[PDB]
């Protein structure tokens, strides 16, 4: 009665925390996702860079599929970076989800300056001969800002191949975005 | 109730004068994974972009023999006259009675997996139905999509 | 209520230009054994498969004199104009007002046995009505089929 | 009061059992059917073999009329074999309703092996000059398996003429199938 | 004896009928006995005589009635009965059946042998034995559930099949006994 | 209904089984029906094929089992069963017996005909008749009193005797159905 | 202990499973142990053998079943499992995945490497190390929320990828263990 | 309460009586034995006649095995005749268990006179081509006379082959005797 | 009072689980045994293979010492594999405790097929220059099957040297078996 309740919420924090990243049998290599919030669903984006040079920076503005850009009032809870590696891979990548002011600036070599301030978390990923890296999944949160789908144009993902010019089929990227449900029909279609 | 109107737009390629056409009901794969879900009534719609001057004998049912091929053997299948047929020769908004028909399955409950066995069968009669003249629509009714509660892994 | 819609599909054979046709109402034998059952309203429907270009003067009533033969003596029977007639010269889904008429018998209660005495009478006017052009439908209403509780012996 | 009730159910078993097969005046030669269950109705199949050879085996998969194959979700309570003899008859037949795995095997001369295991009851029928055999009606039950009309494709009837090549008009066969009511209309037909 | 022995008495009375279905009782030692007519209804017989059909030939026959019966074509028909009484000189075989032919919707030529096959009605066989005369030669086809009348008795048709011989007209008689209500009584002053 | 109709209900239920021991019931019209397996136990079949022994020759055969069954040789055996299923071409005669041979204490050469004589076990005959196929071809030998197990099923031996013919291998199949407990269920993570 | 220690007991029992997710326990010191089958369901294995595909080649394979399982295609499937058991001579690498291919809507030619990219399913890697054998080689993909049956097991497809070598057929076996309900028990008298 | 008890004993008589001889599935050809009484056990005798002539009478005095003849005070409840047929058999036999006065008379052709009086039941057995005879088991009762094992010498079995001289291996006979338990040991053996 | 009791049993699970394998000071290199159950004792077997070839499979049926094989009714709780390494060791071994059907099959090269099904846990052991492997002790449980000492003949241990032909003195094996107490004497010996 409101005394074991606060103790139960303390221990449930430790169950999440002590199982942050360990090779659990439900997903033994790559770290598992967290559950979508009741309400919201997800929506993916596969972005393909052009063949940029060896060790070159890369800028990319976030667009969306056009069925999503209709309802530009619904909120965006969190967004996600998946970096799924296909087998032939020896390179390194850094991924970042910073806020570029929209069309206030370019993306030419000031991107390497944008890695320096650290206003956002930075996802590294590197090849090891010892084994594949277990943790390749960043979650950048947005629930405090109450942003919407209409503000998703403002953000920009920043990619950096370092030790190689990235071949277009050595490592795919993804930007998964969690927003509310696209509104359901039910009217008589004409 | 509990339904979000799944639209599939399937345009048929080019016909000659007095020739048939068949095409099977292939759906998006977010729907096909919901194979158990009960399927209510369905309808078709014929929306022409202008440059249109033609008329059609569109009718859809299950193709027998588990989807044997659908050219010139549906000529016997248009010879029965069991289900009604939509004939569009009006070319003005309102002169046509209706763009739509009915194929209810509430007692049948032929599911999403049974939509693999259905095939739109098309007859054309005039002008051989050149490019961009009509845009066929087929709208189905089937119990509401359960969304995943897990972000991609 | 209490009724399952008994459909009988009777296509008429080939006519000449300006000739009549008659055919009696024969039903499936699972229905004819239910002779006592009360019969409500009935209707006809004209569904053409395409290749169709014709028009008809379909009208059904009881043939008198206990089914005397039904060629060229129904020309006087189309000369009265008592019951309405369906004329199909539209050839598009919705341009026609209606494919259906009405012959209610709720006060008459002319039973299943009295369906032996009815005869579809057909007039054709254009194109002599060649093969597979129209598929006639006639749908009746009559108290619900009692199924047997005994497996075959 | 719940004491003669159990005695009444015991004696009613004996009324069925002691009248299993006797030439009752309601049906004096062939054994009578049992009543269809409240709910279910029946549906017949007359199967006609091709002219197979003298003493040859015979396989046949169960199909249905196409009006039945629509509602392939409704249950099948029991199925029945009638072997009605027409007058000119001197031969012998064996009928069996086994479960063949669907398209996992052929039906060529392993059918005589399928008579041997005895996983299903076997209906014999033979001519006698002493008189016509009184019992020519097998009931194979299916209420425990909760099978449907969609599983009726899986079964196969196995026929064996023994002492003769079967003429097509010396003995008819039937497969009567008891399933639920094909769903009633009541909508305004168009 | 208060609604608890009553249900036990109705169970045992079923067994008295059932265990005495066919046995050579002393009240009728060779042919199986009839059942009692229902209170109300009476009976009415028909002797039908086929023409000399060929050896092993099928035979169709529509049910007519005597004309005094065909007047009151509204009264119900409870059950009908087939008696096959054998006269002494007999060695042949017969099959009798009481099926529903759709009235004038079809003929009776050699599709009768197809009508034996479906089994929608019970089939009465009868055959000679040198071991003795067959004890059971009496079919009762019931009609109380359909609520048919005398006016529907035209629709039925009896189907006869001599098998091992061409039937001589005086080797075996047939009968169709029909149980319907009482033909209405007079009592008016006749003129 | 308080411990006085209970004993009367158990008496009448004996008569329902007994008076329906063998009669051509519509659920199985020719061969006698099986009895229900006990809650718990399941069954397991054996088809045995003799070599072509001579005309009227005896035959011995020890009971083996499939090797998946011989693992759990501690579980009990409730009853065992003989099915003799006839295929159509058949005119011969067979006798089947389920006696206890002492295991490897003796041979099976022509003392088998002496083993038919003592009658310590029931003997299933089966013979062809032109009058018709024999309705009863199913022996049940009980074992619930001895509390034997699957490990003792090696000790028994089935004894077959073709009499009027040398048995062709495809005129009549035999079976030995054995009712024992459930082979133990898995549920562990397989590796 | 009244609905207040009950919720605390369920919290700590989560930590006993979680803190013992993978550690070399003495009950199974090298390969991670299975979880217990649910009360009800049993298991059924499949050993799949690829043809000799090339070095670093993709591989597609549709899930079939043994034919005794494909009979009862109405019973549910709780979970399915991937075991990758290594035999000793092994230096290669494999990736195993249990994705949903739409049934006969597409081929399996080199779009399989695209199917690794979306990440709608967990991906089991396995690689040789000279430091030692990898302790975790057992994926469990769950299906209890979808209420799928045995009849839907045809729709799934396992995706294998040898990477650093052309896979010899006897360097590493694969398995697909499937947990579904009990195949229905007999108990009827066998004929 | 002592009113359904007498009704239960009436119906249990009918269960035995209506199942006197019918081919039950527990023993389908030869009629089954009855249960030994609590107490008593059984003891068998196989008797082998010499090759007597065609249609000849046969006398045989009842002896016992010598382990049984020790305790000649214990009672004899009932005795039994089994006539087990081996396959090659076409003959006929009559078996009878009469009381011959011990050494007061011979057994030469007055045995056929001993069949005539009918003071004991007579078991016939005959071959039929229609099938093997189902009933081949006589039980002669002795519980009223209170005889013992010492009086079993007085009885004599009477066999009559009729249609053939009996070959010694066409049909075996048996005399099964139900008496009390031969007394159990338990002393320290020396 | 029956509420801290269930919490105490939850935490005691975590004390075992979080101390599954760690280098505790009571046994710093090889993982410790678990306590024998009250009742049962243990019994060892050292098995010595012949010099099989390089990378060759190996089969071996479980026998026992003859003093144990007397009381073949007593139960077997669990059995154990110890793989004790002596110093000169660079090879690799796999050990498995599968159920071979007794004399139903050989052990020639189908043993490598028996590794594939995974019906039993598989103990690997490999040399590392980084250090000796800490976990070399499999426990296969048998308490659910209620097997006895008489069924220990049915099992077979499967050994596989992989990278070398095993010298007979580079690595010993053991099979420790936990069964009940061999029955105690106390009678006056003669």
Numbering used by the authors:
A (entry chain B), D (entry chain B), H (entry chain B), I (entry chain B): 29 to 218
B (entry chain A), C (entry chain A): 66 to 218
E (entry chain C), F (entry chain C), G (entry chain C): 28 to 218
Quote the study that presented this structure, word for word.
Here we demonstrate that VLPs derived from Cucumber Mosaic Virus can be engineered to incorporate an internally fused Tet-epitope.
In contrast, replacement of the first 12 N-terminal amino acids of CMV with the TT epitope resulted in well assembled VLPs with a size of approximately 30–40 nm in diameter, as shown by electron microscopy (EM) and dynamic light scattering (DLS), preserving the native T = 3 icosahedral structure. We next characterized the molecular structure of the newly generated CMVTT VLPs by cryoEM. The structure of CMVTT appeared largely identical to the parent CMV particles (RMSD 1.8 Å), particularly at the surface. Specifically, the subunit arrangement of the asymmetric unit (chains A, B and C) was identical between the parent virus and the modified VLPs. The AA dimers were arranged at the 5-fold axis and the BC dimers around the 3-fold/ pseudo 6-fold axis. Upon closer inspection there were minor differences in the spatial location of the backbone polypeptide in the capsid interior, most likely due to the lack of native viral capsid–genome interactions in the recombinant VLPs. Instead, the modified VLP exhibited additional electron density displaying 3-fold symmetry within the interior cavity (orange color), indicative of novel ordered structures, most likely reflecting tightly bound internal RNA. Interestingly, their relative location and resemblance to tightly-associated RNA species would suggest they might contribute towards stabilizing of intra-subunit associations underlying the overall stability of the particles. A further intriguing aspect of the structure is the relatively large pore size, which may allow for the exchange of naturally bound RNA by other poly-anions or other cargo.
